[PDB]
């Protein structure tokens, strides 16, 4: 087996992991190497912490390591048996992946939804404008959370709401926060198989309530769309994912049930919410703490957009520094520092070590992104490192893997980048920013809180001015 720290009886290595396990794993792998055995109680795991080992796992043996480890929380409303996120690579997963690649996240579909997202960006602009008149600090975590939910809801459901914090949006927010509280804590049933039948912390029960809330809303949206399409055959076709769902269902070309689609929408909606929310916050935090970089991005946006307030997504090719800024946030602050787990579908040898069937595989993208043997000055925020650099986060550069790579690489990347780039551009272009209070500024920026997505323990509070 790969080398690693001595595992104690019963608990394995679990007692050493602390509040930020990805940081502990990063330091451990400096000692034990880029393939490292960790015993999460009885859940045997191997940590991957090199670009070289990530390529061996995700690409050379990408089919063997194509499975997922499935947390007990994921069994809520039998999501584990329906979900593109957790099914094994097989016909049903392949069909759902094809639907996302060729129809939902196509260039054609992303361009068609650009206007839906533009109005949500305008709503964000207006909201921040009021705080700026008042002189009030903006809580960037909450602003990014609402904006991301609004942008996701627009793209997936064409949600209407003229208010920034609409009641539909705030119900989504309640649900997403609830899922994060549940999953964001250790479920001992995940680590001790004798406890699974018992659900001793009620994690799966509590997850059922939130998953059910979300599926109920999605099923309602789907049924409403089906009825309005039936009643209004001549109305223009909407440019959202729900329209695509409906057409695919009624064309009946896929061996997929209705719940595959509702659960896919669930997966996509939750998929883009904490991830973009924390990333937007980190982007603003890095820029506020590195005023030279804030100035350089402002200068680019001024040059390209000038007096326009809302950048078109179509303009992204003209904004290389904005792209470099987001790459650099992804390098330092991958929202999931250990990505989503993979699983060995069979015994496999890697670098002379046996990786047994069923091993949980965690890619420590965070460690790789901060490894000094790979990145110069790894702890410094330096977007310029990506200018005229062909390294990207699409999965082909194993130094930068915030979205994974190989078989299960994030299918929502096309939408995520549009959200990240535009939310950042809107905030940076239209206001200057100061910390509400800079007395513990460095500590506020460094302090991470682990969870579904790793985020600043202290929410960023900054005052907008013009
Ligand atoms: C915003 C930043 C985002 C990051 C950093 C991110 C990252 C990731 C990562 C690391 C994975 C696992 C990849 C692997 O197994 O190799 C993943 C999977 C996934 N992501 Fe994302 N993601 C983001 C946004 C989104 C968005 C916007 C959506 C939906 C629109 C989404 C939907 C998914 C889904 C459904 C999967 C599961 C795919 C599968 O297992 O086949 N993500 N993401
Ligand atoms: C984008 C990446 C990080 C992501 C992680 C968690 C989520 C993904 C999409 C779907 C979603 C559920 C199926 C609702 C289960 C909890 C986490 C997970 C799998 C996608």
Curated annotation (Swiss-Prot):
<dbReference type="InterPro" id="IPR036396">
    <property type="entry name" value="Cyt_P450_sf"/>
</dbReference>
<keyword id="KW-0408">Iron</keyword>
<keyword id="KW-0349">Heme</keyword>
<dbReference type="GO" id="GO:0005506">
    <property type="term" value="F:iron ion binding"/>
</dbReference>
<dbReference type="InterPro" id="IPR001128">
    <property type="entry name" value="Cyt_P450"/>
</dbReference>
<comment type="function">
    <text>Cytochrome P450 enzyme (CYP) which catalyzes a unique two-electron oxidation cascade on abieta-8,11,13-triene to produce ferruginol, an intermediate in tanshinone biosynthesis.</text>
</comment>
<keyword id="KW-0560">Oxidoreductase</keyword>
<keyword id="KW-0472">Membrane</keyword>
<dbReference type="Pfam" id="PF00067">
    <property type="entry name" value="p450"/>
</dbReference>
<dbReference type="InterPro" id="IPR002401">
    <property type="entry name" value="Cyt_P450_E_grp-I"/>
</dbReference>
<keyword id="KW-0812">Transmembrane</keyword>
<protein>
    <recommendedName>
        <fullName>Ferruginol synthase</fullName>
        <ecNumber>1.14.14.175</ecNumber>
    </recommendedName>
</protein>
<keyword id="KW-0256">Endoplasmic reticulum</keyword>
<dbReference type="InterPro" id="IPR017972">
    <property type="entry name" value="Cyt_P450_CS"/>
</dbReference>
<keyword id="KW-0503">Monooxygenase</keyword>
<comment type="similarity">
    <text>Belongs to the cytochrome P450 family.</text>
</comment>
<dbReference type="GO" id="GO:0016712">
    <property type="term" value="F:oxidoreductase activity, acting on paired donors, with incorporation or reduction of molecular oxygen, reduced flavin or flavoprotein as one donor, and incorporation of one atom of oxygen"/>
</dbReference>
<keyword id="KW-0479">Metal-binding</keyword>
<feature type="topological domain" description="Cytoplasmic">
    <location>
        <begin position="1"/>
        <end position="466"/>
    </location>
</feature>
<keyword id="KW-0521">NADP</keyword>
<dbReference type="GO" id="GO:0020037">
    <property type="term" value="F:heme binding"/>
</dbReference>
<dbReference type="GO" id="GO:0005789">
    <property type="term" value="C:endoplasmic reticulum membrane"/>
</dbReference>
<dbReference type="GO" id="GO:0016102">
    <property type="term" value="P:diterpenoid biosynthetic process"/>
</dbReference>
<feature type="binding site" description="axial binding residue">
    <location>
        <position position="410"/>
    </location>
    <ligand>
        <name>heme</name>
    </ligand>
</feature>
<keyword id="KW-1133">Transmembrane helix</keyword>
